[PDB]
Amino acid sequence: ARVKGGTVTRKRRKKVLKLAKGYYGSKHTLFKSAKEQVMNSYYYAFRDRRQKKRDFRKLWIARINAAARMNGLSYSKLMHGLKLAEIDINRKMLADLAVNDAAAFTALAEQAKDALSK
Amino acid sequence: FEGGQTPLFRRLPKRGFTNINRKDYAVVNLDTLNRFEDGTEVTPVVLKEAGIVKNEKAGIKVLADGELTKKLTVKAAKFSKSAQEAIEAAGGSIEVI
Amino acid sequence: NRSAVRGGGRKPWRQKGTGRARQGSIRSPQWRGGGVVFGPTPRSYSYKFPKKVRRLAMKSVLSDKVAENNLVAVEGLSFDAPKTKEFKQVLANLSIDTKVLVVLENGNDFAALSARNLPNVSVVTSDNVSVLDVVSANKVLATQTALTQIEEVL
RNA sequence: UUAAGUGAAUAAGGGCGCACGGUGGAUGCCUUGGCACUAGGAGCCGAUGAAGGACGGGACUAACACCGAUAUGCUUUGGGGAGCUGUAAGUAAGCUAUGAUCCAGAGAUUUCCGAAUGGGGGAACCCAAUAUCUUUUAUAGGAUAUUACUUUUCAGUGAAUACAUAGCUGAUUAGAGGUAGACGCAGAGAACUGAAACAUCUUAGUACCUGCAGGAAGAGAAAGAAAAUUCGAUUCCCUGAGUAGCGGCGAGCGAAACGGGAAGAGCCCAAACCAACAAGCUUGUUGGGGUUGUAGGACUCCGAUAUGGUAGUCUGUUAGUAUAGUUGAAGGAUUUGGAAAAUUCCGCUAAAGAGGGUGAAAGCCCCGUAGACGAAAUGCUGACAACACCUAGGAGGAUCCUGAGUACGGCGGAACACGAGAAAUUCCGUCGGAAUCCGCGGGGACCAUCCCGCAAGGCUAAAUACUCCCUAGUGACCGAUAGUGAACCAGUACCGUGAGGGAAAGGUGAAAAGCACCCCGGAAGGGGAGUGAAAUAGAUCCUGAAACCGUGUGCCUACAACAAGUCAAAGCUCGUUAAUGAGUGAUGGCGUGCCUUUUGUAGAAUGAACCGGCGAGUUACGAUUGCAUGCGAGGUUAAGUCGAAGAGACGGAGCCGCAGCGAAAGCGAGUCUGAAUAGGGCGAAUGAGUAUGUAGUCGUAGACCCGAAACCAUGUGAUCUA
RNA sequence: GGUAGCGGAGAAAUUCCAAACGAACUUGGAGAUAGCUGGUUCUCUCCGAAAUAGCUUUAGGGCUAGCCUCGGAAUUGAGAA
RNA sequence: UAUCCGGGAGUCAGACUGCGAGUGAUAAGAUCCGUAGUCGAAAGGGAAACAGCCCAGACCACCAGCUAAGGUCCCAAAAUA
RNA sequence: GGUGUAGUGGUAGGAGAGCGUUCUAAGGGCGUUGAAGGUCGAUCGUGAGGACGGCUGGAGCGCUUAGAAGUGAGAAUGCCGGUAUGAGUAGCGAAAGACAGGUGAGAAUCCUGUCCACCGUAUGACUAAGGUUUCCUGGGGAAGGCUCGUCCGCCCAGGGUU
RNA sequence: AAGCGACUGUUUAUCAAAAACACAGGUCUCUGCAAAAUCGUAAGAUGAAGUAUAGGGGCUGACGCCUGCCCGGUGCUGGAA
RNA sequence: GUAGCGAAAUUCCUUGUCGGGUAAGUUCCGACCCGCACGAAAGGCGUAACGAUUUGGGCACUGUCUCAACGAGAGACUCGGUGAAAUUUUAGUACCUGUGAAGAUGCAGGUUACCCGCGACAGGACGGAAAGACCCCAUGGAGCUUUACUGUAGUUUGAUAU
RNA sequence: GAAGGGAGCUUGACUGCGAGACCUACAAGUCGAGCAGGGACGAAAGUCGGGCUUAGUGAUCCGGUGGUUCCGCAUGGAAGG
Ligand SMILES: [K+]
Ligand SMILES: [K+]
Ligand SMILES: [K+]
Ligand SMILES: [K+]
Ligand SMILES: [K+]
Ligand SMILES: [K+]
Ligand SMILES: [K+]
Ligand SMILES: [K+]
Ligand SMILES: [K+]
Ligand SMILES: [K+]
Ligand SMILES: [K+]
Ligand SMILES: [K+]
Ligand SMILES: [K+]
Ligand SMILES: [K+]
Ligand SMILES: [K+]
Ligand SMILES: [K+]
Ligand SMILES: [K+]
Ligand SMILES: [K+]
Ligand SMILES: [K+]
Ligand SMILES: [K+]
Ligand SMILES: [K+]
Ligand SMILES: [K+]
Ligand SMILES: [K+]
Ligand SMILES: [K+]
Ligand SMILES: [K+]
Ligand SMILES: [K+]
Ligand SMILES: [K+]
Ligand SMILES: [K+]
Ligand SMILES: [K+]
Ligand SMILES: [K+]
Ligand SMILES: [K+]
Ligand SMILES: [K+]
Ligand SMILES: [K+]
Ligand SMILES: [K+]
Ligand SMILES: [K+]
Ligand SMILES: [K+]
Ligand SMILES: [K+]
Ligand SMILES: [K+]
Ligand SMILES: [K+]
Ligand SMILES: [K+]
Ligand SMILES: [K+]
Ligand SMILES: [K+]
Ligand SMILES: [K+]
Ligand SMILES: [K+]
Ligand SMILES: [K+]
Ligand SMILES: [K+]
Ligand SMILES: [K+]
Ligand SMILES: [K+]
Ligand SMILES: [K+]
Ligand SMILES: [K+]
Ligand SMILES: [K+]
Ligand SMILES: [K+]
Ligand SMILES: [K+]
Ligand SMILES: [K+]
Ligand SMILES: [K+]
Ligand SMILES: [Mg+2]
Ligand SMILES: [Mg+2]
Ligand SMILES: [Mg+2]
Ligand SMILES: [Mg+2]
Ligand SMILES: [Mg+2]
Ligand SMILES: [Mg+2]
Ligand SMILES: [Mg+2]
Ligand SMILES: [Mg+2]
Ligand SMILES: [Mg+2]
Ligand SMILES: [Mg+2]
Ligand SMILES: [Mg+2]
Ligand SMILES: [Mg+2]
Ligand SMILES: [Mg+2]
Ligand SMILES: [Mg+2]
Ligand SMILES: [Mg+2]
Ligand SMILES: [Mg+2]
Ligand SMILES: [Mg+2]
Ligand SMILES: [Mg+2]
Ligand SMILES: [Mg+2]
Ligand SMILES: [Mg+2]
Ligand SMILES: [Mg+2]
Ligand SMILES: [Mg+2]
Ligand SMILES: [Mg+2]
Ligand SMILES: [Mg+2]
Ligand SMILES: [Mg+2]
Ligand SMILES: [Mg+2]
Ligand SMILES: [Mg+2]
Ligand SMILES: [Mg+2]
Ligand SMILES: [Mg+2]
Ligand SMILES: [Mg+2]
Ligand SMILES: [Mg+2]
Ligand SMILES: [Mg+2]
Ligand SMILES: [Mg+2]
Ligand SMILES: [Mg+2]
Ligand SMILES: [Mg+2]
Ligand SMILES: [Mg+2]
Ligand SMILES: [Mg+2]
Ligand SMILES: [Mg+2]
Ligand SMILES: [Mg+2]
Ligand SMILES: [Mg+2]
Ligand SMILES: [Mg+2]
Ligand SMILES: [Mg+2]
Ligand SMILES: [Mg+2]
Ligand SMILES: [Mg+2]
Ligand SMILES: [Mg+2]
Ligand SMILES: [Mg+2]
Ligand SMILES: [Mg+2]
Ligand SMILES: [Mg+2]
Ligand SMILES: [Mg+2]
Ligand SMILES: [Mg+2]
Ligand SMILES: [Mg+2]
Ligand SMILES: [Mg+2]
Ligand SMILES: [Mg+2]
Ligand SMILES: [Mg+2]
Ligand SMILES: [Mg+2]
Ligand SMILES: [Mg+2]
Ligand SMILES: [Mg+2]
Ligand SMILES: [Mg+2]
Ligand SMILES: [Mg+2]
Ligand SMILES: [Mg+2]
Ligand SMILES: [Mg+2]
Ligand SMILES: [Mg+2]
Ligand SMILES: [Mg+2]
Ligand SMILES: [Mg+2]
Ligand SMILES: [Mg+2]
Ligand SMILES: [Mg+2]
Ligand SMILES: [Mg+2]
Ligand SMILES: [Mg+2]
Structure with a gap:
């Protein structure tokens, strides 16, 4: 009962890459750079949803x-x-x-x- | 293991011995004897068939834990003194097989 | 595993100096073609339930069939010669079209043969009937002698 | 016009989004081949030359496969019935109803090397002797047979030496070597490791080496197990039990008997004594005799010359079976389609609805399957017979026999779970060394009594272990980085002096229908034209991801200091799973990656070049707890038998629980300590367990994965260098 | 041509023994052992430490306790302020 | 909330600040205890930046409001009070 | 289900509940009127993740319930493959060549000729080992040759050792 | 002109060529021959088809002048009440 | 502890003191002797000849130097052809002062700076290369030593068998 | 009001224990009224299970000595526990 890698890996990584559209070069092309950048984007997004209230x-x-x-x-x-x-x-x-x-x-x-x- | 502290068993001394001629008896109590009818002849075979004593070990010994209520003739390897008194006071009898 | 894979004895390269990750054998699990860590091994999956539980299970399936009225008892199944067409007509006469477990007494070879090839029919002898067979079948077609023998067995 | 002020647009290049390509080979689907097993078969092959090879044989012949100078095959007996001359196309030449090719049985041939054996040798080569034959006028040349060594038996010859013996010659006899990387027995026999160090001990009598084997081996017919009174060879399974025990009493090691099963089978000598033979009253050969413990046998008396059995035989006869085979039911239409098995409509078959193939998914098209039938030849099994070999009862003991350098003892080792220990029992080396039926051995030092048995001689089937192979199948086993290292010309290529190490590499299409012809080009390669359902299926050929590379452009970008984002936002462009849309984005606010390891890392600490794939807590057996189910003072079967490799049935031996206390005798709802009706400890009063499933954790195993420097045991190396 | 690893050889350097010799190379024991370093892959919800004591051929290891978590029993409610 | 019974752990390198002591030189971002907090395992606001200090504990959405520490001339929200 | 109150940072770690992957069983389905797979999209859910369209593709695959695991990767100086960066950069491995003519699709590099230059106890001539066809003749220009190549110790076909 | 080594030689292939090693010479000691010594379980070998002016081992190191004191201790050799 | 030699390949104090040599000499030579800690075959002292040996002085000679200049060639540089590698988390990759795991291209404040390159240099990226060999640790490893512990091959002595 | 000092008699520097406490990870450690047996002193009360209190000690294995109504591998002994 072997479970070979399949397609779940590609699907998950592609979701991350799509989230990273518009980034600079490798930050949208490469999964590892994209993921690392997407995490920082999440950090900034959560922090900025609060800072935005202060700014206005x-x-x-x-x-x-x-x-x-x-x-x-x-x-x-x-x-x-x-x-x-x-x-x-x-x-x-x-x-x-x-x-x-x-x-x-x-x-x-x-x-x-x-x-x-x- | 205790990381090098002397373990508990090492601290404690060995004790005793095992008797080669040790004899253990399968124990039976008066409450179990109540399961039989008056006048019944209680025997190690009877107990084994009834399933009360699957392994008789060195023999059946009857103990007086409960209260007996039926008259019975009980045959067993041994009887406690209280057990014999209870059986006989109930109008029964005891025989040392 | 790495012990069973072919070859793989020597150390691929010295412990230090080469600048490569340290390795012990070309057959280590992380190597392409290396042994498998753990993985399947031959073993048995069969276990036994208490006899009382087994008996209760068998009685439960049979009782369930009867309660739903999916148990069809027939006086007898006799075929002068094995003919699946005749047995199929028998099912039609009894008005059975779904999955059926046909329970025959020992020796009813013509009935057994004539029925077995039908796609929806599973033939079993009254002495050899199992929880899985009864549960699989939507209806149970049993002969009267078969039912008698079953009652004796249980 | 002058002056002051504001001031877009441009892209050498770049960024983002999008579209289309290329590279590459992930993914999906598929499978030539694997993996683990089940049932049956077969468990050896060799001096009558093996295993494994080298070299050859084809009309073309590099390779594989097959064959051996009779070479891509020969003969014969069967099967089969139309094509065939392998892979493997292409020609070329042929064979075949006078039955080919092909399939099975039997047989012929079977070069050279290899135990290799006439001698030699750097394997597949060289050189001989003897005899017969052959070519030449003749020598040279060629063919055939024999020619190793040792062992057995025989014969002749035959020394020192007289007889002899030894040697030598011949004949005769049976061995050598290889395996199946398995299983068995034996000799010899590690270390890492564990003990958290290490020496006793453990790893472990394991790995390795060597010998001998057989299809099994080994063991086996009591100087036994016991002490319920009894059992009655051996082996193996369950259980006893992680008990009794062993143990720097540490780490650990760890039984046996009883009980339950599988399978069952018992027999021969030595000796006494008898007969014969031979030499030198005994003493060897032969045949009889006899075989044991409730002692037997001889021997002496009696009576029976039967009765039964066998583990024998290339003895037939017979049956069955293995190795080829024959037969074997039932569908046409309609829709989509390149193609129907798919769809739809009516049918039909089924002792066959297993499976595979066929232009997509077929019970009815094909190969098959259920079922029926079949063997000239050669094995295998079973029966029957034949031959063969074993097979006597009773009563007496006067005497005789019943295994000697043996048993046993001292010393030194070793095997028994038992490490010298109180240490039986078994074995080895050395030395000493018995008795013999009123006898001897054992019942865990030893003695007495009692019980059980009769050593120092041999053989023996079945239950058991294993699978290189062959046949038929199976799988909640793999599906091309997986599965064998090897799906493919793999133990190959390649690496190394050598032992040795050791790869990569599957997929056009239904069918090659594998792109005629034309055009650019020297070709390669393209564009047409064609084949095709599809050519962006064109041989690097299914699908064709990502990294990476490039073309086109909607937006932005040449006063800007940027972990590259996020939040706010003009402008421009575009219009979606129609959503308070999408792309880009001037400008402004905030803002030092991910991981590991740390008191603390943006860290100037560690890891990652990127992308893809692969890559780490599993299984077995036990312990314990939770949850669940069944039964409940009860619960439950294990091995094993039947059964589909199933369920299930039987199997109650055994295990857990229902009573504990004590070191133990022992007593018992108590018991132990104690002088104690005292106190106190542990228990009861005050009861729930057990079988199984499942999950958590633990123990034994590599035990979550990767990693040493090293240690030990066989081998390979002095072609470098001393 | 000879000497082979528990070894050889050495006008002697731990020097050579097939491009690394304080003990060659290859295969096997073997997945040696590693209290050491690195790695260990999906998600959300509830709760949430410790870096201390004692002992340790022990000190960057381990064992019991302390601190966390999950389930359960029971109480004259025993905790906290 | 405490106990008690049981299943499962991890932890045994701690850091700084305030206060009380020792060692040191009444040195050290030193060392060793006691005590409280924070970090560790805690994002947010302030201290320019700044784990441990001051304020304060993020389940989420909002282009709503009131405050804490700390601030109100410009960078830079709010007193040229 | 409604209301109310309270609570919902978190490493080691404990507990609970889920997502997804392959396979098995059963049921119920989908597929040349196009499955899986690939790609794009502005889609749904609290999360892992799930749909639905367009395109590609060409034959198998979902769904529900239960079962079993080789069940999830981003890091191990991890293994294998592919492709980048450095970068059109280092390097192209001791020395003299010039020109005319020829060949040819194409010539610094191949052939011919002339001059020049180099070695000459060799860089000449023989042989042993070793190599094992590299020898000759005729073709070729894929790859090999550190450029080029019409040429070669290369490839192709014949032939050669008395 | 000084040190070291007498000298020619040899040595760490691949960081040391030297004052290091060797050396002729000196000295001590073992060895009566199946010698001692060494390889080997043994057989069998080397020593040596040699025989004390020979062979092995230790030290020193051409040559020249020299080589003092200690036998308590440790080794060796002898002794044997 | 004799002869001999002695601040030595030995002398720490030490550049001992004195003399020679030099303008100036921690080195060198001669001498002295408080020999930290020479010394007679692990030889003492001396020694012609020898040395790719170590040491000091002198003549000659010079680009070694004052102090650099020119020239030739190869590379470098431009063009045509061919075409790697170490490294590499992604990078639109400034300076100062400060901060911070206490040494910042990336953080704070300020300053400077149009976009892209080419030829040069090497201050930094605690630059690359090598899981530091120094140091410490592990109840790690290995080689070696011995009056460490326990064994043991050999050698020898006795009893006993032959 | 002695626990310091002196005298007389004595051996409680007792045997079997021990409610309950302290300390504590464990193993241990500390205190103990009181019950019984049999005592010393004292007229009696009553005190006494060492010393004014707190150190003066060492697990297990193994072995020795003494006691013992315990066991005793067929049984009685023994060997040995
Ligand atoms: K532009
Ligand atoms: K041979
Ligand atoms: K085998
Ligand atoms: K060992
Ligand atoms: K250890
Ligand atoms: K046998
Ligand atoms: K056990
Ligand atoms: K131990
Ligand atoms: K006989
Ligand atoms: K067809
Ligand atoms: K079919
Ligand atoms: K036959
Ligand atoms: K013994
Ligand atoms: K016995
Ligand atoms: K016996
Ligand atoms: K295609
Ligand atoms: K673009
Ligand atoms: K921004
Ligand atoms: K570093
Ligand atoms: K009592
Ligand atoms: K009591
Ligand atoms: K239960
Ligand atoms: K359980
Ligand atoms: K494992
Ligand atoms: K485990
Ligand atoms: K050589
Ligand atoms: K040498
Ligand atoms: K707990
Ligand atoms: K503090
Ligand atoms: K799609
Ligand atoms: K796994
Ligand atoms: K990686
Ligand atoms: K590259
Ligand atoms: K590049
Ligand atoms: K040519
Ligand atoms: K020298
Ligand atoms: K010399
Ligand atoms: K000298
Ligand atoms: K030299
Ligand atoms: K030397
Ligand atoms: K001399
Ligand atoms: K000498
Ligand atoms: K000496
Ligand atoms: K000498
Ligand atoms: K002396
Ligand atoms: K002496
Ligand atoms: K001096
Ligand atoms: K000195
Ligand atoms: K002077
Ligand atoms: K000199
Ligand atoms: K020299
Ligand atoms: K010059
Ligand atoms: K740091
Ligand atoms: K630099
Ligand atoms: K070493
Ligand atoms: Mg993967
Ligand atoms: Mg706010
Ligand atoms: Mg291996
Ligand atoms: Mg690297
Ligand atoms: Mg594999
Ligand atoms: Mg024929
Ligand atoms: Mg021969
Ligand atoms: Mg150990
Ligand atoms: Mg055989
Ligand atoms: Mg048919
Ligand atoms: Mg149809
Ligand atoms: Mg033993
Ligand atoms: Mg003996
Ligand atoms: Mg005996
Ligand atoms: Mg008897
Ligand atoms: Mg047998
Ligand atoms: Mg493979
Ligand atoms: Mg694939
Ligand atoms: Mg492979
Ligand atoms: Mg396409
Ligand atoms: Mg393709
Ligand atoms: Mg400006
Ligand atoms: Mg601008
Ligand atoms: Mg640190
Ligand atoms: Mg790195
Ligand atoms: Mg050799
Ligand atoms: Mg040789
Ligand atoms: Mg040295
Ligand atoms: Mg070498
Ligand atoms: Mg091992
Ligand atoms: Mg919380
Ligand atoms: Mg200790
Ligand atoms: Mg500090
Ligand atoms: Mg931490
Ligand atoms: Mg904070
Ligand atoms: Mg931090
Ligand atoms: Mg306000
Ligand atoms: Mg303002
Ligand atoms: Mg003001
Ligand atoms: Mg909160
Ligand atoms: Mg699939
Ligand atoms: Mg996995
Ligand atoms: Mg990767
Ligand atoms: Mg460059
Ligand atoms: Mg060149
Ligand atoms: Mg010359
Ligand atoms: Mg040529
Ligand atoms: Mg040519
Ligand atoms: Mg070229
Ligand atoms: Mg010299
Ligand atoms: Mg010289
Ligand atoms: Mg060198
Ligand atoms: Mg040198
Ligand atoms: Mg010397
Ligand atoms: Mg001086
Ligand atoms: Mg002077
Ligand atoms: Mg000296
Ligand atoms: Mg001397
Ligand atoms: Mg000297
Ligand atoms: Mg260039
Ligand atoms: Mg600072
Ligand atoms: Mg700084
Ligand atoms: Mg920044
Ligand atoms: Mg940096
Ligand atoms: Mg560096
Ligand atoms: Mg390190
Ligand atoms: Mg006895
Ligand atoms: Mg006995």
């Missing part, structure tokens, strides 16, 4: 800060004022308003400043 929050914060400065306020003062005024609009929506609906962002800033004054 950072981006929204920066844009909100610019808009707040134009309206006569710092980012920190704006957020403190919004918390005082009970505004729960998050940073994603705030950044979108700053870029697209400048009037709406200005209205938000006015309420924030009023809460700060009170």
